[PDB]
Amino acid sequence: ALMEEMEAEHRLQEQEEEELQSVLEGVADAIDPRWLRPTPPALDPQTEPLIFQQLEIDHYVGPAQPVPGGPPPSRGSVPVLRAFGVTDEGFSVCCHIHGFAPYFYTPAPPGFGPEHMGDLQRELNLAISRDSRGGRELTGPAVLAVELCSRESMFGYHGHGPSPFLRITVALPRLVAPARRLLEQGIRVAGLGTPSFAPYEANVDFEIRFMVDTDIVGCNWLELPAGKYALRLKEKATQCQLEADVLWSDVVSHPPEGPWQRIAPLRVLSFDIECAGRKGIFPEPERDPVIQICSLGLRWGEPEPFLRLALTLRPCAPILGAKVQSYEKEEDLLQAWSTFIRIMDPDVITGYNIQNFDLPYLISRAQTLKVQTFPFLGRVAGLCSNIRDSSFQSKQTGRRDTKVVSMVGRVQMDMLQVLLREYKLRSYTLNAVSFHFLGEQKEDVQHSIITDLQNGNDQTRRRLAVYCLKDAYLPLRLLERLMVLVNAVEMARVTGVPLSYLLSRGQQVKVVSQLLRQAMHEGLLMPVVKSATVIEPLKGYYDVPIATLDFSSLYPSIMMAHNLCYTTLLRPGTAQKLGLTEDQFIRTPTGDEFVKTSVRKGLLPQILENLLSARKRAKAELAKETDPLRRQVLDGRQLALKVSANSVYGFTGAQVGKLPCLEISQSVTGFGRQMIEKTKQLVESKYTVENGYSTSAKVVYGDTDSVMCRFGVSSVAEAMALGREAADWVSGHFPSPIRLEFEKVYFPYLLISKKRYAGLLFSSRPDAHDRMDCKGLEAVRRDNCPLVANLVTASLRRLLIDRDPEGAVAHAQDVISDLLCNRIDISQLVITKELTRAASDYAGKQAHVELAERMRKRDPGSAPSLGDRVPYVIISAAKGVAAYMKSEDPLFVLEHSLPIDTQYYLEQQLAKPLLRIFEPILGEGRAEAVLLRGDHTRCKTRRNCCIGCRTVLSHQGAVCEFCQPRESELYQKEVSHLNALEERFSRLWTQCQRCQGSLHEDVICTSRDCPIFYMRKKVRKDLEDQEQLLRRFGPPGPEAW
Amino acid sequence: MFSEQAAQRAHTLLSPPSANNATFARVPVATYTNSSQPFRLGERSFSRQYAHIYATRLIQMRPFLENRAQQHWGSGVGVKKLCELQPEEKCCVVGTLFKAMPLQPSILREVSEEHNLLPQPPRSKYIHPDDELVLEDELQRIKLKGTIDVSKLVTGTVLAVFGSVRDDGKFLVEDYCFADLAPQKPAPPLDTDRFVLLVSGLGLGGGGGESLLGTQLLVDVVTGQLGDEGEQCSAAHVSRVILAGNLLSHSTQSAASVEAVKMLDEILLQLSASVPVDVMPGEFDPTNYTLPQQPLHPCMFPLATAYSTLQLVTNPYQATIDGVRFLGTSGQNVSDIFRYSSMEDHLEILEWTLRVRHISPTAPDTLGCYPFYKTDPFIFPECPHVYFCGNTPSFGSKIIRGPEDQTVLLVTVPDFSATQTACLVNLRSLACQPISFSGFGA
Amino acid sequence: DQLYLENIDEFVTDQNKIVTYKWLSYTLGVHVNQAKQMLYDYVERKRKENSGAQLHVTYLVSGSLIQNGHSCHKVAVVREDKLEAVKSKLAVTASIHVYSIQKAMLKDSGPLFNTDYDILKSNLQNCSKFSAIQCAAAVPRA
Amino acid sequence: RDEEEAELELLRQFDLAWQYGPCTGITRLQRWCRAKQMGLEPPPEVWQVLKTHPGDPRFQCSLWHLYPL
Ligand code: SF4
Ligand SMILES: [Zn+2]
C-alpha cells in the first residue's frame, strides 16, 4: 500500500509547488581575479547566433514583455520559461522564452458543432469566475482558446478511425487542475444540455509539455538564430552574464548525435562546514557557532580542482597549495562565503549530506545572527532561499525525512541521496563508503576534541582546516570515480527529462515523456485511467562444469516479438463483429487476443526497436574510439539505453500508476513460462547418448533469464563448445529477436537453493579462472556481525578453490571452538544500530534505546545523540532479564572484562547461514549434528598463587616448593607469549600513524568502526597484565651500576 | 697473526709419550667496563604513543646537520623551516624521510573483511619502482623530486636537503648530506697481542651433524682441549668470547625448547670454566621483541650461572675492553634495512648505518621498539672503535676513516650454523682474521 | 708402560668402542697431550708386528689458508688417505696429531660427536680439569 | 574561581603548545622537565602552578587523559 500513498504525497507536493511559484511577490529586496567567469566579448545580435547547452528549465509567472516580432507589449499573467546553461567559452547564459500556454484535450460529445465552440468557451470563462474555488486569484480570461482537431485514443483497438477532439488552451498553468475537474461534472451548454468531458493528458507538467512540443531533450544544445531574438542591456532580473529574449517557435534544438555530443565546461563546487558545539550535545543552530567552511571548485574536464578555499574563524596558519582567510566575527565569515558563492557562480553544487544538515544549519544560523543578505544564493535577484520539509519512503531503501532547500539556477547533487537511490550497502556513513569504494579508511574525530582544538593556537586551527578540506574533497573523488555526472547527463539526454527531475520524481515521468514523444507523431492521445513455473532445481555440489545460457532482455524481446502494446489490444468478443480473420491475431495463454504487425504496429515495439538500434550503434562505435572521455560517454549511453528498455515493462506492469494494464503483464509472464518450458524440453531432446554423444545432458536450474545446464563433460573446452552449439540450435527455433546466448561456465558449482548458487567464474580462458562468483548475498543485513560474512566467505573459498569440504568443515569447527572459548576478538562481534526513530516512536523497548539512556546517565559527554549509530554486544546475564537489557557498549565491556553471552551468538548468528550452506553438501539434519551438535560443538574447557599447583602462596614467588624443579619450563611458556604480544603492538600504533598521514603529530583517531581501535587498547591492557605477571619471577639482573 | 704466532713452537705430539707436558695460563683482562646503561630499562610502561620517539630524535639532530651544511655549501645558505619557504627560492631544509611503498605489509588489510585476498607469502625486498619520498619536519609534509635516490634510502633517516619549492608544490633537490661521524677520543695503545673472539648463530636444536661437530671443535679450541702446543699457546691469549644472538634454532620457537636450552646450558658451562663469556639475546632467543632486548633470565641456566665469568647482556652491547670501545647488535636492523632497500652487500649497509649516526634508522616504523619519551639512546654519543653485527651470510671486515680523523673497524660475523666461521679481533693493530672449522662427510 | 696399551687393545678389539682422545683422557685420568701421545705410540707400534690391524685412524689438520682474499685459519678432521692433499693445500701447518681410532669404518662423523657428548655429560663437574689451559679467575660460587 | 580558571587555561595552553612535542600519555611535570632538559626554556609560571596544586588530577593529567585515544 506504499505505492498509492507515495503517489498521493507526490501529487500533494506538486500541487503545493504550483501554488505561489509565481515569483512576482517573492521579490522583497578582496576579490581574487581567479574567481571571475571569463569576460564576454563584443557580441552583435544581428549577425551571429547564440549557442549554448541548457541544464535546468523552470517557469515563472509575470507580466508580458515586448519580444521583437512576437507578442504585443502587454502585462497579462502569461507564463514565461527560463533556461539556464553554459556557452562554449564558459559564459553563463540565462534565456527567457515567452508565449507558451498549457493545453489539454477532451472528447467530442455527440451532436457537437463548431457554432457551439465559442459559446462553450464563454461558459468555461464563466466557470472559474463564478467558481470561487481556485484561490480566488484571477485577472482576465480563463480560457485562451478552444480548437477542434482529429485524434484517436491510444487505449484499445476501435478501428473506426480518428474522431473529433477539442483542444482547450488556458492562460495559466495552475488553472489546468481546477477547470479539468469541472469538465468531469458536466457543463450546462444551451442546446447541448449538460454534457461531460473526459480529461486527457491533464496531469502533465508545463515544462515537460514544452519539451515535447518543441522537441528539446534534457542537457541538449540550443541555438537561437541571429536576428530572431533580443538582448537585454539594462534591468537584468538574473545574475548571469547574457540574458536573451526569444519566442518559443524559433529556438532550434540540436539532438545529441555526433559532433553535438560534447559537454560544456561546467563548474562543480564541493563544499563542507565544521562547527564547534557544546560537550555531549548534538550541534544546534541557535547557540553553536560555525567555525570553518571549506570549498573546492573544479571545471568539468580537468583532472584537478582549479580552486581551493578554506575560510576559518580566528587567525590561522598558512597552507601550501590553497588560500586561507581569517575573519574576526562570524557574521563577516557568513557574508564573505555568500559573496564567494555569488561571484564564483557554480552550476553544480555537491558535498556529503548537504541537503539535510549543511544548508538548513547555515540558513538557520544566518537568520539567528541577523545577517540579512546571506540567503540570496539563487541566480534570481531577490529570491530568498526557502527551507521545506519532505520525505521519501520505500520498503527496500527505508524511510528518509529530509529538508529541501530551493536554489533557482543551480543543480544540487548530494552524494548521500545518489548512493541511497542507486546502491545498497550495509552502512551509508562517509567512512564506510570511502573504505568500500576507494580502499582508504578515513580518520574520525569527536566533537569535544574539535572544540578543544578551536581554543588552541594557530597550528591546531590549521590542522582542523586541513581535515575539513580533506573531508570536503573526498566527495569530488567519489564523483570522479563513479562518473555519476556523466551517467546523469546520459539519462537526461535519453529519457527526455531535465537533469534535476532525476532526483525529485519517480520512474513514471521518464516513460510518460518517451510515450508522448513517440505518440505525437501518429496523433494518438493518452487517456487517463485509475488503478510462475520455475524449473525445479537440485540443491547440491556439482563437481562437473555447468553451462550458463542467458536470455538477452527476455521481457522486452517478447514484447517486440508478438506485437504487445497498448494500441494492439483487442476488446473481448469484438473480432467476430469486426470480421477479423483467425490468422490475424494471436491468443495469449491468459486469454487475451493481440493483432500482429500486419494491421497496426504498437508504440512499445517501436520504442524498444529504436532503443536496441541505438545500443547496437553505441556498441559498434565503442570499439573504435580511443579518447577516454568519449568512451565514458558511450558507456553511459549504452547503460542508460539498457536501463530504460528494462524499465519500460516496469512502468507498464505496475498495478498503481498513470496507465496500468495487467493483461500485458499476464501475457508476458505466460510467454516466459512457455518459452522456458520449450527450451528445457528441446535441450533434453537434443543431447542424448543415442545420437553418439558421450553423456546425457539435462537442465538443472531455470528461471526467467537464466538456464544452468549439466552436459556430463569434464573438459571446459568441450563444455563451452557444446554450450555455444546448444545456444545456436535453440535460438534457431525461437521466432523474432528473442534469442538465447552462452554466458559462462562454473566448474565447481554449489547450489544451495533457488536464487542461491556459487561457483568459480570462467569467461574467456577455459583453463584460467577469473573470480569467485556467488549470488544470494545472504550475509548482507547490517545487523549481522562481520564474523558471519567472514566465515561464509572462507567456507566458499575453501569449497570452490581448495575443493576440500573436509578443510571447510575443519575451519568451521575451529572458528566455533574459538568463539566458545572467548578467543574471538570483540571487534568481530560488534552490532551497530541507528537511532532512526525517537524513543517514544518505538512500539516496544529495544536494546539500543536502553543502552543510549544508560550511557547518557553515566556521562553525557560521550553519549551519542538521536540519529547516530550506537554499537553494542550481547553480554552474559542472568536468566529472566529482559532481552533488550543485555546490550552494552564495547568499551565498557573492555574496561570491566564483562562476560560475553556466547550462546546467543552461536545460536543466532552462525546456525542459520551455516545450516543453509552445508545442508546441500552433508545432507539435511546430519549437517546440523556435524556443525553444532557434538564434542567440538561443546569443547568443555585475589592473592598470588602458584601457576603450577594453583595453591595459595605464603610468599610472593612464582611457584611453591612442590613445583620448583619445573620453574624453568614455566618461564619459556610465559615470555614466548609476551613476545607474541609485543610484535603485535609494534604493528598496531604505527599503522594508525599511516592512517593519520603524519608521523610527528599526535593521533586523535577515535573511530568506533575500525577494529584497530579496539585491538590496540586490548593489546595495551594485555601487555600491562603480562608484565605484572612476569614480574613475579626474579629480576633478570641489576640496573643501577 | 694467528698462524705466525702458532708456528713458533715445534710440533711434539707425533712422538712416544713424554714425562713432561706444557701448561699455559689464561691472560687476565686488564680493564673492563660495561656501559649498556641506556639500553638497560627498569620498570617498563606501554601507555604512550610512538610519536615521542620521533620528535625528540629530530630535536636531537638539528644542531648537528646544520654544522654539516656549513662544511658543504658554505655559510651563504640559511636553514629555513617549511612554513617559512617561498616558491623559487634556494634553501636548505632539515627533516625526516617517509618512503611510501605499495608492498609494505598492513595489519588493516590482513584483518579487514578481505582476510585472504589471495594471501601473499613472505618474500625478499619489498622495494617497488613506484615508491615515493616525502620530507617531513614537525609541522608539514612535502614530496621530493630531483637528483635523489628513491630505492637506496629508507624510512627514519634524518637529513638536510638543499633545493627549492617548485610551482606544483613538490621540492626539487640538488644535493643532500648526512650527519657523518661523531667526535672520537683516541684509544690508549697496548703492549702485547690480545684477541677477542666473535661468534654468532650457534643454531642449537637443528640436528645437523656437521654443525654439531663444528660447535664441538670450536668449544675444544677455545678452552684449549684440542690442538698442539703452539696452537694452545696462541689460543691462550683469547681474552674474551661473545655469543651474539640466534642461539637456538628456527623450529624451537612456537616448542621442544626444553632440550635446546639444556644443550645451550651445557655449552655455556663448558665455556665459562676456561674463558669469560658474554651472551647477547637474539631474535629467536626466549626474550621480548623490542629492539632493546633485556638479558636472558638466569633461572633458565641452573648450571652455568654457578660461576662468575658468565655474563648476560642487553642487545646493543656497548662495552669497553682494554680501553677499546665495542658496540654490537644482533643483526635485526641490518636485516630490516636489507629487506627495505635496494642495497645488497651487508658491509655496505653497516657502513651506511654508521654514516647516518643511528643504529636502527628504520625503527620504529618497521622494527619494533620501546616508545621512549625522554631520550633516544640509539644515536651515537661517541664514535666507537669497533662496530660489529652478527648473523650475516658472508663474513666481512673493513677499516674506514671519517672526515675528522676517525678510525672505525666494521665486522660482519658469519652465521656459524651455516658457514662454521668465527672472527678473531686483535686489540693492538685492530686487525680481523676469520677462522673456520669443518668436518669430513661422505 | 704396556698396561694402557693392553687396555686400549681390549677397548678396541673386544668392546669395540670408538676411542677418541677426550674419552681416553677421561677414562685414564691423564693430561690430554699425554693421551694423544699414547694413541700415537699405539698406532705406530701396532703396524710393525701385526700384518692386519684394520684401523681407520683419523687425523686433525690445522693451519693457514687463502680464502676470498683473506688469511683464513683452518681446523679440520680428515681421514688417513686425504692427508697429503690437505697438507699440500695449507700454506703453513701448525698442529698435526692423532684424533680418533675405531675399528669399524665411519661413513660420517656422527658417532664421534655422540661418544664425546655422552662422556662429556657423564662428567660435567670436571669439564676442564684436564685441559691444557687453566684459569684462576673462574672459581665456582656455592 | 577566577584564579583557578585562569590557571587551568594557562595549563591548557601549555599542553596545546606545538614546540615541545606531543602531550599524550605523560604528566605535565614530566613534559616540562623534558622541555627544560633540551634547553627550550619552558615558562616558569607553568612549573609554579604545577607545584602549587599537587595530586589533583585536573592539573597533573594531560588534556587528552580522559578520552580513550
Ligand atoms: S587510526 Fe587506525 S582505527 Fe583509527 S581511523 Fe586510522 S586506521 Fe582506522
Ligand atoms: Zn606449585
Author numbering:
A (entry chain A): 39 to 67, 74 to 575, 584 to 993, 1008 to 1107
B (entry chain B): 1 to 254, 270 to 457
C (entry chain C): 3 to 144
D (entry chain D): 39 to 107
Manuscript text:
Among these, DNA polymerase δ (Pol δ) plays an essential role in DNA synthesis during lagging strand DNA replication, the initiation and termination of leading strand replication, and various DNA repair pathways. Pol δ is a member of the B-family DNA polymerases and exhibits activity, fidelity, and processivity in the replication fork complex, making it indispensable for genome maintenance. In humans, Pol δ is comprised of a catalytic subunit (POLD1/p125) and three regulatory subunits (POLD2/p50, POLD3/p66, and POLD4/p12). Pol δ forms a holoenzyme complex with proliferating cell nuclear antigen (PCNA) that is critical for efficient DNA synthesis.
The cryo-EM structure of human Pol δ was determined at an overall resolution of 3.65 Å. The structure revealed a fan-shaped architecture (∼160 × 100 × 80 Å) comprising the catalytic module (p125 residues 1–993) and the regulatory module, which includes the carboxyl-terminal domain (CTD) of p125 (residues 1007–1107) and the three regulatory subunits (p66, p50, and p12). The p125-CTD plays a critical role in maintaining the integrity of the complex, forming extensive interactions with the catalytic module and the regulatory subunits. The p125-CTD coordinates Zn2+ by CysA cluster (residues 1012, 1015, 1026, and 1029) and 4Fe–4S cluster by CysB cluster (residues 1058, 1061, 1071, and 1076). 4Fe–4S clusters provide redox potential for several enzymatic reactions; however, the 4Fe–4S cluster in Pol δ is located 20 and 45 Å away from its exonuclease and polymerase catalytic centers, respectively, rendering it unlikely to be involved in any catalytic activity of Pol δ. Notably, the cryo-EM density of the linker region containing the PCNA-interacting peptide (PIP-box) in the p125 subunit was disordered, suggesting flexibility prior to binding PCNA. A striking feature observed in the apo-form human Pol δ was the presence of an acidic α-helix at the N terminus of p125 (residues 39–58). This α-helix occupies the single-stranded DNA-binding cavity of the polymerase domain of Pol δ (left). Most residues forming the α-helix are acidic, allowing electrostatic interactions with the positively charged DNA-binding cavity. Local resolution of the α-helix is relatively low suggesting its weak binding to the DNA-binding cavity of the polymerase domain.
